[PDB]
Tab-separated table of C-alpha atoms and ligand atoms in Angstrom:
chain	number	residue	atom	x	y	z
B	1	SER	CA	-4.705	5.576	7.487
B	2	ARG	CA	-2.540	2.740	6.080
B	3	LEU	CA	-3.186	-0.610	4.365
B	4	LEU	CA	-1.097	-3.752	4.836
B	5	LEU	CA	0.479	-5.036	1.619
B	6	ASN	CA	1.382	-8.714	1.106
B	7	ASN	CA	5.060	-7.867	1.554
B	8	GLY	CA	4.355	-6.559	5.066
B	9	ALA	CA	4.768	-2.858	4.227
B	10	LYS	CA	2.115	-0.296	5.048
B	11	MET	CA	0.776	1.773	2.160
B	12	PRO	CA	-0.710	5.209	3.005
B	13	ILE	CA	-4.359	5.303	1.904
B	14	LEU	CA	-4.098	8.863	0.490
B	15	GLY	CA	-1.429	9.795	-2.037
B	16	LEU	CA	-0.583	12.714	-4.362
B	17	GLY	CA	-0.880	12.069	-8.095
B	18	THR	CA	1.477	13.758	-10.554
B	19	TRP	CA	0.144	13.107	-14.060
B	20	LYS	CA	-0.167	16.454	-15.895
B	21	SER	CA	1.683	18.274	-13.139
B	22	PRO	CA	3.986	20.661	-15.048
B	23	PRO	CA	7.724	20.409	-14.187
B	24	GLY	CA	7.732	24.072	-13.235
B	25	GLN	CA	4.947	23.526	-10.676
B	26	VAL	CA	5.289	19.973	-9.310
B	27	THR	CA	8.331	20.562	-7.027
B	28	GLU	CA	6.309	23.144	-5.143
B	29	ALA	CA	3.270	20.902	-5.164
B	30	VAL	CA	5.152	17.912	-3.691
B	31	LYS	CA	6.874	20.029	-1.031
B	32	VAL	CA	3.520	21.451	0.110
B	33	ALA	CA	1.976	17.961	0.024
B	34	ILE	CA	4.725	16.677	2.357
B	35	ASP	CA	4.358	19.680	4.744
B	36	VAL	CA	0.595	19.114	4.813
B	37	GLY	CA	1.208	15.497	5.707
B	38	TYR	CA	1.029	13.456	2.482
B	39	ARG	CA	3.431	10.502	2.682
B	40	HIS	CA	2.613	8.730	-0.615
B	41	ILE	CA	3.410	10.119	-4.088
B	42	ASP	CA	2.277	8.465	-7.298
B	43	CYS	CA	4.818	8.869	-10.161
B	44	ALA	CA	5.645	7.568	-13.640
B	45	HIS	CA	8.450	7.941	-16.161
B	46	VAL	CA	5.908	8.782	-18.869
B	47	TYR	CA	4.710	11.847	-16.916
B	48	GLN	CA	8.064	13.533	-17.829
B	49	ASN	CA	8.396	15.133	-14.374
B	50	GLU	CA	10.148	12.636	-12.075
B	51	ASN	CA	13.301	14.799	-11.868
B	52	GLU	CA	11.312	17.681	-10.446
B	53	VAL	CA	9.328	15.438	-8.095
B	54	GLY	CA	12.676	14.110	-6.926
B	55	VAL	CA	13.964	17.618	-6.159
B	56	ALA	CA	11.040	18.121	-3.752
B	57	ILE	CA	11.557	14.772	-2.036
B	58	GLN	CA	15.305	15.476	-1.605
B	59	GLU	CA	14.571	18.891	-0.111
B	60	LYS	CA	12.143	17.517	2.515
B	61	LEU	CA	14.516	14.657	3.407
B	62	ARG	CA	17.457	17.026	3.863
B	63	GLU	CA	15.168	19.240	5.967
B	64	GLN	CA	14.387	16.316	8.356
B	65	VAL	CA	10.628	16.849	7.744
B	66	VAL	CA	10.307	13.185	6.894
B	67	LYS	CA	12.704	10.256	6.902
B	68	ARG	CA	12.876	7.989	3.864
B	69	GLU	CA	11.117	5.084	5.607
B	70	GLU	CA	8.094	7.301	6.242
B	71	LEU	CA	7.609	7.967	2.509
B	72	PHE	CA	5.871	5.603	0.082
B	73	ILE	CA	7.032	6.350	-3.448
B	74	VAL	CA	5.419	4.677	-6.442
B	75	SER	CA	6.467	4.652	-10.067
B	76	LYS	CA	5.512	2.633	-13.139
B	77	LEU	CA	7.204	0.801	-16.039
B	78	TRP	CA	6.199	2.288	-19.396
B	79	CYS	CA	4.964	0.114	-22.264
B	80	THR	CA	8.084	0.592	-24.391
B	81	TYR	CA	10.199	-1.117	-21.707
B	82	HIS	CA	8.427	-4.462	-21.341
B	83	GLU	CA	11.091	-6.766	-22.726
B	84	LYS	CA	13.237	-8.510	-20.142
B	85	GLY	CA	16.497	-6.732	-20.821
B	86	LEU	CA	14.953	-3.245	-20.665
B	87	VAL	CA	13.059	-3.443	-17.354
B	88	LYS	CA	16.019	-2.940	-14.989
B	89	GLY	CA	17.201	0.012	-17.054
B	90	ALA	CA	13.835	1.778	-16.943
B	91	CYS	CA	13.688	1.320	-13.141
B	92	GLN	CA	17.189	2.721	-12.649
B	93	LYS	CA	16.390	5.784	-14.760
B	94	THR	CA	13.379	6.480	-12.533
B	95	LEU	CA	15.506	5.937	-9.427
B	96	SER	CA	18.078	8.564	-10.510
B	97	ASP	CA	15.457	11.154	-11.553
B	98	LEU	CA	13.702	10.725	-8.184
B	99	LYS	CA	17.162	10.566	-6.528
B	100	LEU	CA	16.261	7.499	-4.450
B	101	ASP	CA	17.921	4.097	-4.066
B	102	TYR	CA	14.715	2.060	-3.889
B	103	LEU	CA	11.033	2.427	-4.741
B	104	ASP	CA	8.362	1.259	-2.326
B	105	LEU	CA	6.201	0.039	-5.215
B	106	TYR	CA	6.803	-0.348	-8.964
B	107	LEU	CA	3.880	-1.052	-11.320
B	108	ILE	CA	3.597	-2.344	-14.862
B	109	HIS	CA	1.779	0.778	-16.128
B	110	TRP	CA	-0.323	-0.971	-18.801
B	111	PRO	CA	-0.488	-4.665	-19.850
B	112	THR	CA	0.313	-3.671	-23.469
B	113	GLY	CA	3.925	-3.720	-24.647
B	114	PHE	CA	4.967	-1.336	-27.443
B	115	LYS	CA	7.978	-1.444	-29.745
B	116	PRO	CA	11.044	-0.182	-27.821
B	117	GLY	CA	12.278	3.258	-28.831
B	118	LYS	CA	12.294	6.925	-27.927
B	119	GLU	CA	8.615	7.487	-28.710
B	120	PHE	CA	6.304	6.630	-25.811
B	121	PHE	CA	3.655	5.722	-28.409
B	122	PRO	CA	5.570	4.396	-31.443
B	123	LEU	CA	3.584	4.688	-34.693
B	124	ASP	CA	3.988	2.956	-38.067
B	125	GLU	CA	3.489	4.518	-41.541
B	126	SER	CA	-0.303	4.070	-41.311
B	127	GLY	CA	-0.146	5.826	-37.962
B	128	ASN	CA	-1.154	3.100	-35.499
B	129	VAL	CA	0.687	1.894	-32.368
B	130	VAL	CA	3.357	-0.757	-33.016
B	131	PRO	CA	3.174	-3.627	-30.477
B	132	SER	CA	5.992	-5.595	-28.894
B	133	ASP	CA	5.682	-9.410	-29.095
B	134	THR	CA	6.439	-9.564	-25.369
B	135	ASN	CA	3.828	-10.895	-22.976
B	136	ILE	CA	2.723	-10.239	-19.387
B	137	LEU	CA	4.361	-13.305	-17.794
B	138	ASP	CA	7.831	-12.520	-19.109
B	139	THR	CA	7.532	-8.876	-18.049
B	140	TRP	CA	6.418	-10.094	-14.619
B	141	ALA	CA	9.506	-12.320	-14.285
B	142	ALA	CA	11.676	-9.258	-15.056
B	143	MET	CA	9.798	-7.257	-12.382
B	144	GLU	CA	10.418	-10.100	-9.908
B	145	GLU	CA	14.173	-9.724	-10.238
B	146	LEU	CA	14.001	-6.049	-9.301
B	147	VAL	CA	12.743	-7.231	-5.903
B	148	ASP	CA	15.565	-9.778	-5.684
B	149	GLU	CA	18.095	-6.993	-6.414
B	150	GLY	CA	16.807	-4.501	-3.863
B	151	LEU	CA	15.684	-1.822	-6.335
B	152	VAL	CA	12.037	-2.088	-5.316
B	153	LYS	CA	10.246	-3.302	-2.168
B	154	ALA	CA	7.003	-4.337	-3.863
B	155	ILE	CA	5.776	-4.898	-7.395
B	156	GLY	CA	2.309	-4.561	-8.849
B	157	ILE	CA	0.159	-3.930	-11.880
B	158	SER	CA	-2.060	-1.206	-13.339
B	159	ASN	CA	-5.041	-1.360	-15.730
B	160	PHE	CA	-5.030	-5.177	-15.621
B	161	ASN	CA	-8.345	-6.946	-16.100
B	162	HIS	CA	-9.158	-9.965	-13.927
B	163	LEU	CA	-8.029	-12.546	-16.504
B	164	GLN	CA	-4.696	-10.783	-16.829
B	165	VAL	CA	-4.321	-10.764	-13.018
B	166	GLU	CA	-5.301	-14.449	-13.119
B	167	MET	CA	-2.541	-15.146	-15.656
B	168	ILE	CA	0.033	-13.807	-13.173
B	169	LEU	CA	-1.478	-15.604	-10.153
B	170	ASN	CA	-1.354	-18.856	-12.119
B	171	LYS	CA	2.186	-18.483	-13.495
B	172	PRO	CA	4.384	-21.561	-12.833
B	173	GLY	CA	7.187	-20.590	-10.478
B	174	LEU	CA	5.451	-17.372	-9.388
B	175	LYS	CA	7.706	-15.887	-6.709
B	176	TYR	CA	6.012	-12.574	-5.815
B	177	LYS	CA	2.276	-11.884	-6.050
B	178	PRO	CA	1.180	-8.476	-7.418
B	179	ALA	CA	0.814	-6.254	-4.346
B	180	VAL	CA	-1.422	-3.604	-5.945
B	181	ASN	CA	-3.672	-3.244	-8.993
B	182	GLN	CA	-4.026	0.479	-9.752
B	183	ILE	CA	-7.208	1.139	-11.750
B	184	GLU	CA	-9.578	3.960	-12.680
B	185	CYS	CA	-12.350	4.303	-10.127
B	186	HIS	CA	-14.909	6.954	-9.213
B	187	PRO	CA	-18.734	7.117	-8.998
B	188	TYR	CA	-19.153	6.868	-12.797
B	189	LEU	CA	-16.976	3.735	-12.995
B	190	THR	CA	-17.370	1.905	-9.693
B	191	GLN	CA	-15.509	-1.287	-10.637
B	192	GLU	CA	-17.410	-3.480	-8.185
B	193	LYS	CA	-16.466	-6.770	-9.841
B	194	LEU	CA	-12.768	-6.119	-10.439
B	195	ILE	CA	-12.456	-4.644	-6.961
B	196	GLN	CA	-14.165	-7.638	-5.313
B	197	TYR	CA	-11.951	-9.979	-7.373
B	198	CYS	CA	-8.654	-8.284	-6.369
B	199	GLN	CA	-9.520	-7.955	-2.688
B	200	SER	CA	-10.431	-11.649	-2.521
B	201	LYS	CA	-6.910	-12.507	-3.772
B	202	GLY	CA	-5.197	-10.158	-1.310
B	203	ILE	CA	-4.362	-7.513	-3.901
B	204	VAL	CA	-4.740	-3.868	-2.756
B	205	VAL	CA	-6.672	-1.633	-5.158
B	206	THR	CA	-5.593	1.945	-5.809
B	207	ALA	CA	-8.206	4.234	-7.377
B	208	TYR	CA	-6.855	6.693	-9.957
B	209	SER	CA	-8.737	9.642	-11.476
B	210	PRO	CA	-10.985	9.853	-8.342
B	211	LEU	CA	-12.336	13.268	-9.322
B	212	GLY	CA	-12.885	12.192	-12.922
B	213	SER	CA	-9.678	13.807	-14.247
B	214	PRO	CA	-11.206	17.175	-15.316
B	215	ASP	CA	-7.828	18.237	-16.725
B	216	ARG	CA	-7.409	15.214	-19.017
B	217	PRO	CA	-6.217	16.489	-22.459
B	218	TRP	CA	-9.036	14.764	-24.365
B	219	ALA	CA	-11.844	16.334	-22.328
B	220	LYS	CA	-14.906	17.536	-24.233
B	221	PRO	CA	-17.540	20.048	-22.979
B	222	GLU	CA	-20.419	17.534	-23.313
B	223	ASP	CA	-18.630	15.039	-21.050
B	224	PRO	CA	-20.016	14.434	-17.507
B	225	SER	CA	-18.380	16.231	-14.593
B	226	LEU	CA	-18.194	14.476	-11.220
B	227	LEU	CA	-17.226	17.685	-9.491
B	228	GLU	CA	-20.342	19.411	-10.821
B	229	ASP	CA	-22.793	16.527	-10.310
B	230	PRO	CA	-25.675	18.107	-8.295
B	231	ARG	CA	-26.411	14.767	-6.644
B	232	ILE	CA	-22.821	14.630	-5.387
B	233	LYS	CA	-22.868	18.293	-4.409
B	234	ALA	CA	-25.896	17.483	-2.244
B	235	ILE	CA	-24.130	14.675	-0.323
B	236	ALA	CA	-21.190	17.057	0.213
B	237	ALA	CA	-23.419	19.932	1.442
B	238	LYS	CA	-24.996	17.541	3.949
B	239	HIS	CA	-21.561	16.818	5.436
B	240	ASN	CA	-20.231	20.414	5.261
B	241	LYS	CA	-17.497	19.129	2.941
B	242	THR	CA	-16.501	19.928	-0.639
B	243	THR	CA	-17.443	17.609	-3.533
B	244	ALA	CA	-13.721	16.790	-3.926
B	245	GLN	CA	-13.531	15.735	-0.270
B	246	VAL	CA	-16.576	13.473	-0.753
B	247	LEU	CA	-15.079	11.918	-3.906
B	248	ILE	CA	-11.785	11.235	-2.072
B	249	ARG	CA	-13.493	9.805	1.039
B	250	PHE	CA	-15.651	7.475	-1.129
B	251	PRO	CA	-12.866	5.060	-2.275
B	252	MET	CA	-11.354	5.172	1.228
B	253	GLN	CA	-14.475	3.625	2.766
B	254	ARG	CA	-14.284	0.856	0.177
B	255	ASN	CA	-10.746	0.052	1.456
B	256	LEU	CA	-9.102	1.542	-1.657
B	257	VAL	CA	-5.999	3.664	-1.786
B	258	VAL	CA	-6.786	6.971	-3.519
B	259	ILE	CA	-4.429	9.343	-5.359
B	260	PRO	CA	-5.997	12.737	-6.293
B	261	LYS	CA	-3.724	15.006	-8.352
B	262	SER	CA	-3.265	18.693	-7.569
B	263	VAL	CA	-0.594	21.359	-8.118
B	264	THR	CA	-2.630	23.951	-6.239
B	265	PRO	CA	-1.612	24.393	-2.581
B	266	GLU	CA	-5.110	25.150	-1.215
B	267	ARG	CA	-6.567	22.130	-3.034
B	268	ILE	CA	-3.677	19.914	-1.872
B	269	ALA	CA	-4.527	20.988	1.673
B	270	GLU	CA	-8.277	20.588	1.110
B	271	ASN	CA	-7.817	17.066	-0.260
B	272	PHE	CA	-5.980	16.076	2.901
B	273	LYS	CA	-8.894	16.975	5.211
B	274	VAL	CA	-10.773	13.744	4.605
B	275	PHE	CA	-10.074	11.694	7.776
B	276	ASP	CA	-12.400	13.554	10.135
B	277	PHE	CA	-15.800	12.574	8.705
B	278	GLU	CA	-17.643	9.488	7.462
B	279	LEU	CA	-20.074	8.917	4.620
B	280	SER	CA	-23.090	6.874	5.863
B	281	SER	CA	-23.865	3.482	4.262
B	282	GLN	CA	-26.759	5.268	2.556
B	283	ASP	CA	-24.357	7.860	1.050
B	284	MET	CA	-22.074	5.023	-0.068
B	285	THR	CA	-24.866	2.968	-1.710
B	286	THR	CA	-26.172	6.127	-3.405
B	287	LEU	CA	-22.731	6.989	-4.819
B	288	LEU	CA	-22.384	3.398	-6.081
B	289	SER	CA	-25.690	3.714	-7.928
B	290	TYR	CA	-24.230	6.483	-10.106
B	291	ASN	CA	-22.153	3.998	-12.091
B	292	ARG	CA	-22.283	4.620	-15.858
B	293	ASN	CA	-19.269	2.469	-16.801
B	294	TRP	CA	-17.620	5.691	-18.123
B	295	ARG	CA	-13.841	5.623	-18.587
B	296	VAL	CA	-11.510	8.614	-18.646
B	297	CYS	CA	-8.558	6.387	-19.668
B	298	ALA	CA	-9.538	3.849	-22.309
B	299	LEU	CA	-6.169	3.700	-24.124
B	300	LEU	CA	-8.033	4.077	-27.387
B	301	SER	CA	-5.011	3.868	-29.697
B	302	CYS	CA	-4.393	0.274	-28.547
B	303	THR	CA	-7.841	-1.226	-28.926
B	304	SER	CA	-6.452	-3.835	-31.373
B	305	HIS	CA	-3.477	-4.758	-29.197
B	306	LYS	CA	-3.384	-8.441	-28.256
B	307	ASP	CA	-3.331	-7.422	-24.539
B	308	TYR	CA	-5.887	-4.595	-24.583
B	309	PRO	CA	-7.446	-4.817	-21.113
B	310	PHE	CA	-10.905	-3.318	-21.620
B	311	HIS	CA	-12.671	-5.770	-23.951
B	312	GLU	CA	-13.336	-8.134	-21.059
B	313	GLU	CA	-16.250	-7.378	-18.757
B	314	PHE	CA	-13.833	-6.898	-15.850
M	1	NAP	N1	-1.961	4.078	-13.725
M	1	NAP	C1	-2.568	4.794	-14.669
M	1	NAP	O1	-2.758	4.371	-15.802
M	1	NAP	C2	-3.058	6.171	-14.296
M	1	NAP	C3	-3.893	6.877	-15.156
M	1	NAP	C4	-4.398	8.115	-14.785
M	1	NAP	C5	-4.029	8.630	-13.563
M	1	NAP	N2	-3.164	7.952	-12.712
M	1	NAP	C6	-2.701	8.589	-11.467
M	1	NAP	O2	-3.855	9.072	-10.776
M	1	NAP	C7	-3.608	10.451	-10.462
M	1	NAP	C8	-4.937	11.165	-10.301
M	1	NAP	O3	-5.732	11.010	-11.484
M	1	NAP	P1	-5.835	12.226	-12.551
M	1	NAP	O4	-4.645	13.089	-12.516
M	1	NAP	O5	-6.311	11.667	-13.804
M	1	NAP	O6	-7.039	13.131	-11.981
M	1	NAP	P2	-7.849	13.572	-10.684
M	1	NAP	O7	-7.093	13.573	-9.437
M	1	NAP	O8	-9.117	12.838	-10.776
M	1	NAP	O9	-8.163	15.096	-11.043
M	1	NAP	C9	-7.124	16.093	-11.118
M	1	NAP	C10	-7.744	17.433	-11.484
M	1	NAP	O10	-8.640	17.837	-10.446
M	1	NAP	C11	-8.300	19.123	-9.947
M	1	NAP	N3	-8.572	19.133	-8.498
M	1	NAP	C12	-7.878	18.494	-7.540
M	1	NAP	N4	-8.414	18.728	-6.336
M	1	NAP	C13	-9.447	19.526	-6.590
M	1	NAP	C14	-10.311	20.100	-5.647
M	1	NAP	N5	-10.143	19.995	-4.324
M	1	NAP	N6	-11.275	20.915	-6.141
M	1	NAP	C15	-11.394	21.157	-7.447
M	1	NAP	N7	-10.563	20.610	-8.331
M	1	NAP	C16	-9.567	19.797	-7.931
M	1	NAP	C17	-6.850	19.301	-10.311
M	1	NAP	O11	-6.592	20.671	-10.508
M	1	NAP	P3	-5.251	21.377	-10.061
M	1	NAP	O12	-4.170	20.403	-10.248
M	1	NAP	O13	-5.318	22.455	-11.057
M	1	NAP	O14	-5.488	21.744	-8.660
M	1	NAP	C18	-6.777	18.583	-11.628
M	1	NAP	O15	-7.241	19.439	-12.650
M	1	NAP	C19	-2.794	10.940	-11.632
M	1	NAP	O16	-2.165	12.190	-11.397
M	1	NAP	C20	-1.794	9.801	-11.721
M	1	NAP	O17	-0.896	10.026	-10.626
M	1	NAP	C21	-2.678	6.721	-13.087
M	2	PAC	O1	-1.504	6.316	-18.477
M	2	PAC	C1	-1.491	7.303	-17.706
M	2	PAC	O2	-1.103	7.237	-16.529
M	2	PAC	C2	-1.974	8.639	-18.225
M	2	PAC	C3	-1.317	9.044	-19.516
M	2	PAC	C4	-2.053	9.097	-20.704
M	2	PAC	C5	-1.415	9.333	-21.946
M	2	PAC	C6	-0.026	9.519	-21.992
M	2	PAC	C7	0.718	9.470	-20.806
M	2	PAC	C8	0.067	9.232	-19.580
């Protein structure tokens, strides 16, 4: 139900994701998620919907449905805010949109820093992404002060490869270890090496895009579908569960936190009904064998960036 983080806090193993959740739909989605029993919401400034997520959280708090301590609210620092003097400001903007006074967890969204500005993906005249000369260790030191100032309870990373995680763990004067590395993970990208690395260092892994992100804006029709994989449908039929429920239970039995996105109330409810069954070790080993090393999120505009995470093996 909950995993212990290295700061002592308990992170709920199931959360609601909010990337691509339209502002006009996400307030309803979050309110239903909280009624249904979700206690963990994954957010980000770059999703352009934190205000509307925050309206739902405020409504449920005022209603007494949950108290603030029961909720685990995550957001992420966007790439254009990596320099030291910008980090606190980005966090405070997210805090006011969400209408909270602290975050439970704040992640560096990607290891790549972009030129600061109003564009989330700043382009030059030849059309490619303009990098910041900032690095990971300096951004980490700026994240560490947010903990010292009470704005966030825990800090972590996202889309970091093992050498990048290593860089942080080996930083002279390291005060707070990354609590969480949030990475893409599903049966087509099982991440066995990066997961075994992080867990050995006491870092909790959160699996994003657990259903394969079928609503990703760069989807093609010849791309594989997890939800339609007949081999995964078969494992689900055996358990009297849906394929989505199998795909959500899968990371859970690997001791991963999982954050499926939905704005549809019956799917939000369906995705919650995953605690009352178990995949056998045979089901688990079978699902692991489906690995293709296929990424939904490869950040393909930044493949030349000095900190691009996905050139390394893991
Ligand atoms: N840190 C990062 O870099 C990063 C990157 C990507 C994602 N994430 C986080 O991870 C979250 C989840 O990943 P994701 O949004 O890419 O995708 P996902 O959860 O793998 O898939 C979401 C899609 O699946 C549909 N869906 C949900 N439950 C379903 C069910 N029971 N049956 C059939 N279809 C279902 C949703 O439709 P409806 O919404 O229409 O129901 C939506 O189209 C994101 O929202 C975000 O919070 C983080
Ligand atoms: O990185 C993410 O979480 C997903 C995303 C992709 C492209 C632009 C904004 C967000």
